[PDB]
Curated annotation (Swiss-Prot):
UniProt source species: Homo sapiens
Function: Adhesive glycoprotein that mediates cell-to-cell and cell-to-matrix interactions. Multifunctional, involved in inflammation, angiogenesis, wound healing, reactive oxygen species (ROS) signaling, nitrous oxide (NO) signaling, apoptosis, senescence, aging, cellular self-renewal, stemness, and cardiovascular and metabolic homeostasis. Negatively modulates dendritic cell activation and cytokine release, as part of an autocrine feedback loop, contributing to the resolution of inflammation and immune homeostasis. Ligand for receptor CD47.
UniProt-annotated location(s): Secreted; Cell surface; Secreted, Extracellular space, Extracellular matrix; Endoplasmic reticulum
Protein name as it appears in the record: Thrombospondin-1
Tissue note: Expressed by platelets (at protein level). Expressed by monocyte-derived immature and mature dendritic cells (at protein level).
Disulfide topology: C144-C205
Length: 206
């Protein structure tokens, strides 16, 4: 219940499906070059419910991800899309045009969007992020340094409702505009019962 690797949960490593297996900074884990995010299978409802339960309990989460994004592009890292295809209830977008990490939350009929500034992740090079969300607070760590904070207009658990798995599904690298992720992703994971400090220390940071 501590680690939820999204690519592993979707089964995005099966042979022939919306992505291409490549190498990443982590020599022991598979990396995925996005070819067509639309074709990447959604996280099964049962596994997504486990995630929802974890977020509910911790009143937030710790999201880790390594990315090599195309310059000047808006790329959705992940999103909670409504099963009825009317939109997304939540999304994390690496906005290479604004040089920000955008967090969108739709708490019924209302789309609130907040940008985490000074976060240019869209550089043809590999970057690692640690996003810590607790209540209505967001703290972003890029690599072993840089902390940029932002506050949401509503608490994170307000999105992660009890039976969210019944109306939405978790998609990786897929957007609502034409914000599909362009580039390579690796180790996109939700981690619980741990802190960012605790985790910056376990990657060699200081």
């Amino acid at each position: 219940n501590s680690v939820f690797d999204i690519f592993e949960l979707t089964g995005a490593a099966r042979k022939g499906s919306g992505r291409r297996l490549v190498k990443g900074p982590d020599p022991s884990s598979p990396a995925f070059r996005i070819e067509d995010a639309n074709l990447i299978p959604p996280v099964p409802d049962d596994k997504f419910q486990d995630l929802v339960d974890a977020v509910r309990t911790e009143k937030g989460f710790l999201l880790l991800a390594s990315l090599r994004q195309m310059k000047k592009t808006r790329g959705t890292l992940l999103a909670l899309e409504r099963k009825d295809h009317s939109g997304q209830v939540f999304s994390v977008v690496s906005n290479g045009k604004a040089g920000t990490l955008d967090l969108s939350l739709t708490v019924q009929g209302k789309q609130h969007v907040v940008s985490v500034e000074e976060a240019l992740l869209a550089t043809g090079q590999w970057k690692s992020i640690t996003l810590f969300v607790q209540e209505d607070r967001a703290q972003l760590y890029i690599d072993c340094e840089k902390m940029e904070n932002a506050e949401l207009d509503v608490p994170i658990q307000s999105v992660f409702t009890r039976d969210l798995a019944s109306i939405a599904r978790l998609r990786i690298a897929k957007g609502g505009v034409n914000d599909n992720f362009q580039g390579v992703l690796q180790n996109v994971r939700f981690v619980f019962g741990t802190t960012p400090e605790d985790i910056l220390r376990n990657k060699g940071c200081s």
